[PDB]
C-alpha cells in the first residue's frame, strides 16, 4: 500500500536480529502532511530471512489489540525485492530506555499498569496460538505514559496444530538470559516459556534498568565472568537447575518477587497462566491504590 518513492528516511531507531527499524515520514502528496511511521527492513535479504519476514508480517497483520503495535502495511521495491514492514510510530521508544529516563517519576503502581498491559497483550497472542519467544523490555514500546505495546514479532512462531510447543534452534544466538531452561536444553518454546520470559521482564521493570542489575549482569556474576563462549550456556543451564535465580530487585515487594519466582518454575506445567498473572497484578494494583 506504501510506495517506496514516498518514504522519507528520518532516522534509524534500532537494529536487531537481521533487521533494522527506521523512523520515516510517509508523504505521498510531497506537501509535508504525511505521517511519521516506523519501517522495518532486513539487512541480508536472503530467501530464508525473507520468508521468515513474510511470516512475521502476516502474524502482525493478524493481531489487533490495544497493547500490540499497529501494522499499517507493506512497501516493496520494483518487483518484490526489498520488502519493508510499515507500522505505527510510537514516540517514546522502548520501555527499557523510557523506564531508565523517567525512573524517579514512575512508581510501582505505574510499573504494575505496564505489567498488566503486557500480560493482556501476551494472552491475546496465546489465544491466537502465537509464541513470542523474544519478550523483553527492549521489545516493548511506549505509546504514552499510560500505554505500552508489544512492538516486535521477529521471533514469533505459530504453534503446530497438534502440539503445545515449537522446537526451533536458530543460527546466531538469542537472549539466553531471558530463556526458559527447557528452551536452553531442548529448544522448546511454548506459552510457558513466554511466561518465564515475562517473569524476567517483570524483574527488568523493577530494576529500573539499573546498570549492575540487568539479567545478563546478574547471571554472569552468578556463574562467574571467568567462563567463555559455549560454556556460558552450559553453566547457566545448571544455575537454573539448582534453582539459582535472579535476585529480588531493590525495593520490590515480596509478592511481586513471588510472581517473578513463580514464573521461574523449572516445571513447565506449574507456571502461572497470563490470565492468572493479570488477575494477581490487577488485584495488587487495586490494593496499592
Is residue 21 close enough to count as binding ligand R6M by CB under 6 A? yes
Among 2, 7, 26, 38, the residue binding ligand R6M under the rule CB under 6 A is 38
Q: Is 163 annotated as a binding residue?
A: no
Which grid cell sits at 181?
A: 531452561
Q: Is 40 annotated as a binding residue?
A: yes
Among 10, 16, 45, 110, the residue binding ligand R6M under the rule CB under 6 A is 16
120 vs 138, beta carbon nearer ligand R6M: 138
Clarify whether 194 is annotated catalytic: no
Contacts 24+ apart (CB under 8 A), 175-179: 175/134, 175/136, 176/232, 176/233, 176/236, 177/215, 177/216, 177/219, 177/236, 178/134, 178/135, 178/136, 178/215
Q: Is 19 annotated as a binding residue?
A: yes
Minimum CB distance to ligand R6M, residue 235 (Å):
26
The label of the residue with cell 517514546 reads: 92
Which grid cell sits at 78?
A: 520494483
Q: What is the DSSP annotation of 212-253?
A: GGSHHHHHHHHH-TT--THHHHHHHHHHHHTT--PPPPTT--
Q: Is 224 annotated as a binding residue?
A: no
152 vs 182, beta carbon nearer ligand R6M: 152
**Residue, CB closest to ligand R6M:** 14
For the chain, the first-to-last Cα distance in angstroms comes to 45
* Region 107-166 residues binding ligand R6M, contact defined as CB under 6 A: 138-139, 141, 151-152, 154
Q: Give me the catalytic one of 31, 66, 107, 134.
A: 134
Which grid cell sits at 47?
A: 530467501
* Region 80-99 residues binding ligand R6M, contact defined as CB under 6 A: 87, 89-90, 93-94
Per the CB < 8 A criterion, the answer to whether 77 and 64 are in contact is no
| Segment near ligand R6M (CB under 6 A); pick from 17-25, 71-79, 228-236, 263-271 | 17-25
Q: What is the dihedral of CA 126, 141, 99, 91, to 10 degrees?
A: -160
Q: Is 13 annotated as a binding residue?
A: yes
User: What is the rounded distance in angstroms from the CA atom of residue 105 to the CA atom of residue 190?
Assistant: 35
Interface positions with ligand R6M (CB under 6 A): 13-17, 19, 21, 38, 69, 87, 89-90, 93-94, 138-139, 141, 151-152, 154
The residues assigned a catalytic role are 134
Which residues line the annotated binding site for ATP? 13-21, 40
Amino acid at each position: 500500500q506504501f510506495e517506496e518513492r514516498h518514504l522519507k528516511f528520518l532516522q534509524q531507531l534500532g537494529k536487531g536480529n537481521f533487521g533494522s527499524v527506521e523512523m520515516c515520514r510517509y508523504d505521498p502528496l510531497q506537501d509535508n502532511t504525511g505521517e511519521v511511521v516506523a519501517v522495518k527492513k532486513l539487512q541480508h535479504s536472503t530467501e530464508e530471512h525473507l520468508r521468515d519476514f513474510e511470516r512475521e508480517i502476516e502474524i502482525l497483520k493478524s493481531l489487533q489489540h490495544d497493547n500490540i503495535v499497529k501494522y499499517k502495511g507493506v512497501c516493496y521495491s520494483a518487483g518484490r525485492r526489498n520488502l519493508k514492514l510499515i507500522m505505527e510510530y510510537l514516540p517514546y521508544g522502548s520501555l527499557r530506555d523510557y523506564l531508565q529516563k523517567h525512573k524517579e517519576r514512575i512508581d510501582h503502581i505505574k510499573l504494575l499498569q505496564y505489567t498488566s498491559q503486557i500480560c493482556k497483550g501476551m494472552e491475546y497472542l496465546g489465544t491466537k496460538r502465537y509464541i513470542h519467544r523474544d519478550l523483553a523490555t527492549r521489545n516493548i514500546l511506549v505509546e504514552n505514559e499510560n500505554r505500552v505495546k508489544i512492538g516486535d514479532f521477529g521471533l514469533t512462531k505459530v504453534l503446530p496444530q497438534d502440539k503445545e510447543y515449537y522446537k526451533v534452534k536458530e543460527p546466531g544466538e538469542s537472549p539466553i538470559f531471558w530463556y526458559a531452561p527447557e528452551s536452553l536444553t531442548e529448544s522448546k518454546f511454548s506459552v510457558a516459556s513466554d511466561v518465564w520470559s515475562f517473569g524476567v521482564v517483570l524483574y527488568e521493570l523493577f530494576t529500573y534498568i539499573e546498570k549492575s542489575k540487568s539479567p545478563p549482569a546478574e547471571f554472569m556474576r552468578m556463574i562467574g565472568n571467568d567462563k567463555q563462549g559455549q560454556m556460558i550456556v552450559f553453566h547457566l543451564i545448571e544455575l537454573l537447575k539448582n534453582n539459582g535465580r535472579l535476585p529480588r530487585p531493590d525495593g520490590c515487594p515480596d509478592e511481586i518477587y513471588m510472581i517473578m519466582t513463580e514464573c521461574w518454575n523449572n516445571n513447565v506445567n506449574q507456571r502461572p497462566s497470563f490470565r492468572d498473572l493479570a488477575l494477581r497484578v490487577d488485584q495488587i494494583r487495586d490494593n496499592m491504590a
